[PDB]
Point group: D2
Chain length 127, copies 4
């Protein structure tokens, strides 16, 4: 599908939710990293959540090879805008990708000033 970047099949979607207001968390920054050979974190994709609190088309399946990826969520800047003070600096989700072939990754995240949970729903797409 899309070359280099884009979403050739949409292999990764990040969905953020606000548990204090019961609404989707809009305009949250999401930075995604891939571990490099030197073993440090190399910038991979990034964006802000839409009106539905989702972020997709961060990457493409040709570009999304097996490796170790890190999803960072600027949760702190998010609360600061609502006048609340958070405890965390941000949230990270570190996972190895496509241990045995690609599939979709939906990284979910539920946020509160002092807590956040994160879940992954890995699904084998079809036609």
């Amino acid at each position: 599908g899309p070359t280099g970047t884009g979403e050739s099949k949409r292999p990764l979607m990040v969905k953020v939710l606000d548990a204090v207001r019961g609404s989707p968390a809009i305009n949250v920054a999401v930075h995604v990293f891939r571990k490099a050979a030197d073993d440090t974190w190399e910038p991979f994709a990034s964006g802000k959540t839409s009106e539905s609190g989702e972020l997709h088309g961060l990457t493409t399946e040709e570009e999304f090879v097996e490796g170790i990826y890190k999803v960072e969520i600027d949760t702190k800047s998010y609360w600061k805008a609502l006048g609340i003070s958070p405890f965390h600096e941000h949230a990270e989700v570190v996972f190895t990708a496509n241990d045995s072939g690609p599939r979709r990754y939906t990284i979910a995240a539920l946020l509160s000033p002092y807590s956040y949970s994160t879940t992954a729903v890995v699904t084998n797409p079809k036609e």
Copy 2:
């Protein structure tokens, strides 16, 4: 052993945390019922959490027999008393207790106005 009622070997404790403030949820009313033989819920025990967000002494080893129980946590009153309007009326935890001998049950509850999780920790008595 502790007769009548009380907290014999502490077979049942409830613990509530506030995810918005990062503290124990205090003064949360908790009502516990046991499933009667006529499929109705009979009031079993009740209480309010301490400064620590804990509640022990709801029942006793002798009294805590096999059955189906429901811990109802009054999360609404709690949030309302803070100036927030939660989504849920309350949070229930229904389970079969002691089907294979007396166990000790720690019902943990983490609260957000629009979301809540409950985890159960079951342990074997030893002294």
Copy 3:
């Protein structure tokens, strides 16, 4: 839209997820109740989760009046099929509806043998 039942605008959707396998919880029973005048629970809508773990079209906006609704999730039968033993009998979500006009209700639920969280994302639909 649809008369009586159906989904005139799709005011309530239940989404269930499996946190042990990282997959949507398929074929889970969901029974929804409305408190009646006598104050007991009157059967309102029901169904089983689709392949995506979602359930919608349970009700219609003309039928979904303000009231107290209860979403019961047969989580126990769900684990029993996977060979695991759960702690809970089921999960309930009790909430008052449309305090000030309708909007969509997505009741979410994340399940584990011994824990489950539930969140509501209430959104004002548009055109």
Copy 4:
């Protein structure tokens, strides 16, 4: 007061629960780092949880100065050792500690192979 290192007034405790078995997660390795002045993570403290799923004595009041800290919890090794293959490599909790005087921090973590939540409980010292 407790010099060198230890657990002065217990300014930092980590607690891990297993959502699959309903017990405390035991033998979970935990590494704690402090953000160095050169933006790097310096190893601050480390440990493994007890039968109770707890870890105290990681640091001390004197040593636990203002700064940015990251509690890394090795959730992978834990699940792998059970015959499961988790989704995350580990779980991190990054936060600014003691920006307004010494507080006591209870980092709580609830684990599922495909999901995890972390709640923070901050309290004021009193004796």
